[PDB]
Design an enzyme around this catalytic site. Sequence first.
Site, mmCIF file in Angstrom:
data_model
loop_
_atom_site.group_PDB
_atom_site.id
_atom_site.type_symbol
_atom_site.label_atom_id
_atom_site.label_comp_id
_atom_site.label_asym_id
_atom_site.label_seq_id
_atom_site.Cartn_x
_atom_site.Cartn_y
_atom_site.Cartn_z
ATOM 1 N N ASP A 152 6.813 7.709 4.191
ATOM 2 C CA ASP A 152 5.970 8.881 3.969
ATOM 3 C C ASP A 152 5.640 9.088 2.491
ATOM 4 O O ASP A 152 4.828 9.967 2.177
ATOM 5 C CB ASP A 152 6.610 10.161 4.536
ATOM 6 C CG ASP A 152 5.811 11.411 4.225
ATOM 7 O OD1 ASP A 152 4.893 11.743 5.004
ATOM 8 O OD2 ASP A 152 6.104 12.064 3.202
ATOM 9 N N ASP A 205 8.162 19.451 18.690
ATOM 10 C CA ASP A 205 9.051 19.483 17.537
ATOM 11 C C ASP A 205 8.822 20.749 16.721
ATOM 12 O O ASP A 205 9.035 20.755 15.504
ATOM 13 C CB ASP A 205 8.851 18.244 16.662
ATOM 14 C CG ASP A 205 9.860 18.151 15.536
ATOM 15 O OD1 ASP A 205 11.024 17.799 15.810
ATOM 16 O OD2 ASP A 205 9.488 18.425 14.375
#
EC number: 2.3.1.234
Lengths: 71, 189, 322, 146
Positions: free
Chosen positions: B2, B107
């Site tokens: 990321d 999530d």
Amino acid sequence: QAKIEIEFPSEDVAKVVYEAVLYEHLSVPYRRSEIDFKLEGKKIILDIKASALRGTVNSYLRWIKAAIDVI
Amino acid sequence: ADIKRDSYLDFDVIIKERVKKGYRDERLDENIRKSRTAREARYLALVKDFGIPAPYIFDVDLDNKRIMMSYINGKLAKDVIEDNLDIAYKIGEIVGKLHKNDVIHNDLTTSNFIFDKDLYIIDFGLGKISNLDRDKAVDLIVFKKAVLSTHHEKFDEIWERFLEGYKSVYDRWEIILELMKDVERRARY
Amino acid sequence: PMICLGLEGTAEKTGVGIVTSDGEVLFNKTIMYKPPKQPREAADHHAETFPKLIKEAFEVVDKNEIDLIAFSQGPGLGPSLRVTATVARTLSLTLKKPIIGVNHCIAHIEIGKLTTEAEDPLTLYVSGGNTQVIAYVSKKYRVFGETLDIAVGNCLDQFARYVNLPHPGGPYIEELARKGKKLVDLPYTVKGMDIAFSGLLTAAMRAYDAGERLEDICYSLQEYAFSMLTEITERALAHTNKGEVMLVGGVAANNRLREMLKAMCEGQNVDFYVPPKEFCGDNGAMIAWLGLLMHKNGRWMSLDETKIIPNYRTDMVEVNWI
Amino acid sequence: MDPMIIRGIRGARINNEIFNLGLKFQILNADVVATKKHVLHAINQAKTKKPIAKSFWMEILVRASGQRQIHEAIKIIGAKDGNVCLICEDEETFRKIYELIGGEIDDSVLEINEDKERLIREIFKIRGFGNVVERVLEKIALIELK
RNA sequence: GGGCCCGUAGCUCAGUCUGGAGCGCCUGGCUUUUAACCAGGUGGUCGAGGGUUCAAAUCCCUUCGGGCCCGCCA
């Protein structure tokens, strides 16, 4: 609608079982059926008033038997 | 991963990848990472069509389990919800839109929402499509547990304003709220 | 040194133990209720076993010796909790010793900490009907991730029942999965911190019904389920920033789960622990230890405050032994 | 070391003979190409991805169009009469293509104005809000998904 | 652009040959209640239109969407 009477050798063990089982008795939020749980001298008396009655009587026979046998 | 600090066509972007978690079986790891990348790209793209601000998608790579996405200045919903309490309301809207349009984000946490100018839903990895209110209710339950575990001290106001936003956008909210109690029932007696 | 006698009747595994504060267990015993045809109950087994276990307890240690009685007031099955509570109260009054009703799950964590290395652990507690990850945050034990329909142990048991493997199906399904070669396609749901093993179990049942090989189906089921557990453990480890994880509970017997967690922790540079088989499963020793620890710091408990707590939560314990 | 030559030519007569002439070129309907980015993205995607079309210089068109189908991509975004965008690689071939096609050099047609944005949204089904160039790059990047 | 295949109840598939059940949840019992177990309920008249057929979801055409394949490349 029925009554169950249990007699024990001594008032000592009578109180033993009664006050080791009454807290459980009053710990049930909703009961299987209308119940009464009282101490008469050296004996313990249960009153039942309701299927659910059979379960209640079996369960209480078991509670009292366990309490007796713990000694 | 990321973290890339790269600019695709002068566009600041961070390519995010799912490092192979070796603990699990090789084939299952491959399948899970492939499906997660597919669904994340799919829905980080689709949600924008709902008017739900998010990061951009500019290149997918299922071979490498990578997705390149426009970076957003670091300001996490988890780290600001206690400071700014309106972002909880805003999460209410931008998640009730999901629920009303039959998309599930499994999530839900205040770590999955950035706030610089608006509320960017910067991950959708475990997304799904469902027409059953039960899945939406369980997703709300997941968010409820997350908010408790993170900032239970303010759970009252956080959940109150989350429901405010959910009322504002979603219209049949009460149905799924009632259905939630069925799942809340798992705790045995 | 003060000593305590604990019972354990939250599930089918009637446990009785006597443990000291010196750091050792005087006596521990467990009788696992063998399931009948699918009517006796875990409570029936407790009623007809606790007297016998307590007789052996008397034989190995005198009645007047034990100073405290603890009992697993929750979480657990209603009737079984009630049987253990009845016996606990009866013994408390009979020996004139105080009664304490303690919590099953936290008890598991403290026995794990006692027997294994010393730490403040992230405990993945998995058992027949109690799967969840727990740890110490905000000066209390609080759940992080749990199943919403069925626990891992119940999942494996129901799979065994469907495939007609005799109960317990744990080792049988483990060996069949070991035999398996290809992992069938099964759902993999990790709703953040939670899991829904019902989907996995149902899909595995359907896949077997479709004719897929039993060993392959078992391998698929096991790898999917224990991978979901490992993933929620990873998420909880990240959430709590702790330094070590512990497997605890009956399903801790699965070498594949143990190796999966061990390899995880090796990759993530964290320490994995697990109590010995004698303490993984439900037993009276853990409840005894938890009650002894509660009364050591000076946490009395009125005999009227020892009610059963079926829906006990790991946070309702005012954890005060640190 | 030569990035693909991209130039917008307006008022150029389109002749079908160019395609069969034989050469490496791409012509894009200039009314839909959002900007230079809309074609640099397609270039990168054709270069990197697994080719969908047999030809690199036709995969350029397929990617710029976004839609995997070749018929729709051609009929929609393929260059039409007037304004067009030329994607080329060399000066001599570029000179020949310019001579044949005609028109005048003005990259301003590539840039986006109210009408161009309206057409882009209408033809790419771009509902929702977002930067035009970034979002069209996105819709062109979502090809590698079932 | 075209060919093949798919579409039935809240979910999943038979039923297309040639003219519904399971799952989910609900209710009672099962040692009230469940962990499981047993019984009753809840559930479409079958993607849409046209024609055939007394009689079709079931045979043919078009379309709606979904999957496989054919590509003809400016």
